[PDB]
Paper text:
The protein kinase CLK1 (cdc2-like kinase1) modulates activity of SPF45 by regulating its expression and by phosphorylating the protein at distinct serine residues. The CLK protein kinase family is closely related both in structure and function to the family of dual-specificity tyrosine phosphorylation-regulated kinases (DYRKs). The ATP binding pockets of CLK1 and DYRK1A are rather similar both in terms of sequence and surface shape. 3-Aryl-substituted 6,7-dihydropyrrolo[3,4-g]indol-8(1H)-ones were identified as inhibitors of the CLK protein kinase family.
While the 3-substituted derivative 8a was identified as a slightly selective inhibitor of CLK1, some 2,3-disubstituted congeners and a 6-oxo derivative were less active or not as selective versus casein kinase 1 (CK1) and against DYRKs. The X-ray structure analysis revealed that the inhibitor is localized in the ATP binding pocket, occupying a position similar to the binding mode predicted by the docking study for the pose in CLK1. As observed in the 8g/CLK1 complex, the lactam element of 8a establishes hydrogen bonds to the gk+1 and the gk+3 amino acids of CLK3, and the indole nitrogen forms a water-mediated hydrogen-bond to the hinge region. Compared to the situation of 8g in CLK1, 8a is slightly rotated in the binding pocket of CLK3 so that the indole nitrogen is veered away from the hinge region and the phenyl substituent is shifted slightly towards the DFG motif. The cavity near the αC-helix and the DFG motif is not occupied by the ligand, but by an ethylene glycol molecule which is kept in place by hydrogen bonds to the canonical Lys186 and Asp320 of the DFG motif. In further inhibitor design approaches this region of the binding pocket could be addressed by tailored side chains sprouting from the core element of new ligands. In contrast, all congeners showed considerably weaker or lacking inhibition of CLK3.
Author numbering: 129 to 484
The structure:
């Protein structure tokens, strides 16, 4: 079963050429393909060393900078693994890693669809509030654990949050004369630790996928754990309405959106930033008549107006979201404090105790 170097081949980009039935490490038998990315690909395997159980095996390209990145990812994942020996903090648990002819491979439990793919397959119809609450709780919990360990994820978004199981029932919406998929179990895991960064390491100027990037980062004021909290705020809005809070492609535009949605940037952050071009008279400067300006003006309104209903549940979700999307990161709610928010009184007990 041990593959000699003649049964191993890479495409031009350096991807391992894979086929169903191929073996790795005399242990993992490929039984399917789960997706591809810049880094490489993820395949489903049966782990024959463990009663044929299913795994997701992530295979990094055989390219210098990808392999080295992967080595940092493995360190993060090992620390998580060691600090959550009880399996209770909901970050993907690495079961094995190895170097396959220069491809770094990481083995995990096999999960379901990511929360973005589920949303897309539901035609961007949003998750119902109770699902939003359970998922938000799990996110606060998972990342409070990360933050306690001097780590920041830096790249949280819906595609990096995976359902344990994404089997659904199909329902019907009266109000919109269409079908709706509703996930049966809203248990989630936090994935993709490829950018996670220790407190002691070098902090690059820019982190996060744009739509999920906080103002401190755009303004280049430095960042830390508060970065993730902002991303979570953006994620919750997206789960609740089904569309991106900040559908943006440029910094000035992004800042205007923040202003229109959330109120004025604090002066103190404007005085502190070296990105003074975005400003004028201590005030954010932009062309309201440009394409981007007219887009922002048509489409970006006060945050509270996006509420779908007006009962307590919904009021509390918006209060938490507003606190998570506070401009000033030294004043933004922490996850420890987020877990005490009244929004979370509203959980079922199995949900809260993690009997889900
Ligand atoms: O089932 C899984 N358990 C862990 C895990 C991690 C990543 C993935 C991905 C994937 C695939 C392509 C790009 C990006 C991600 C699909 N399933 C995954 C799993």
């Amino acid at each position: 079963s041990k593959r000699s170097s003649r049964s191993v081949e890479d495409d031009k980009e350096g991807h391992l050429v894979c086929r169903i039935g191929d073996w790795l490490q005399e242990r993992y038998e490929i039984v399917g393909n789960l997706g591809e990315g810049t880094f490489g690909k993820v395949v489903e395997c049966l782990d024959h060393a463990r009663g044929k159980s299913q795994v997701a095996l992530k295979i990094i390209r055989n390219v210098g900078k990808y392999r080295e990145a992967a080595r940092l990812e493995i360190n993060v994942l090992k620390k998580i693994k060691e600090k959550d020996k009880e399996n209770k903090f909901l970050c993907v648990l690495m079961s094995d890693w190895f170097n396959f002819h220069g491809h770094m491979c990481i083995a995990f439990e096999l999960l379901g669809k990511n929360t973005f793919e589920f949303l897309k397959e539901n035609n961007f119809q949003p998750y119902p509030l109770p699902h939003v609450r359970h998922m938000a709780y799990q996110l606060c919990h998972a990342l409070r654990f990360l933050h306690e360990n001097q780590l920041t994820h830096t790249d949280l978004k819906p595609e990096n949050i995976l359902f344990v199981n994404s089997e659904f029932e199909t329902l019907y919406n009266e109000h919109k004369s269409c079908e709706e998929k509703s996930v049966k179990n809203t248990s989630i895991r936090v994935a993709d630790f490829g950018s996670a960064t220790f407190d002691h390491e070098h902090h690059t100027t820019i982190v996060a996928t744009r739509h999920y990037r906080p103002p401190e980062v755009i303004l280049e004021l430095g960042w830390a754990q508060p970065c993730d909290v902002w991303s979570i705020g953006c994620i919750l809005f997206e789960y609740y309405r089904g569309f991106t809070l900040f559908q943006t492609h440029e910094n000035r535009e992004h800042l205007v959106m923040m202003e229109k949605i959330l109120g004025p940037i604090p002066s103190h952050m404007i005085h502190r930033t070296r990105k003074q071009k975005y400003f004028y008279k201590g005030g954010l400067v932009w062309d309201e008549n440009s394409s981007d300006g007219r887009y922002v003006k048509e489409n970006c309104k006060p945050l509270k107006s996006y509420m779908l209903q007006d009962s307590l549940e919904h009021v509390q979700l918006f209060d938490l979201m507003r606190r998570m999307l506070e401009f000033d990161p030294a004043q933004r709610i922490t996850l420890a404090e987020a877990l005490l928010h009244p929004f979370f009184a509203g959980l079922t007990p199995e949900e809260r105790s993690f009997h889900t």
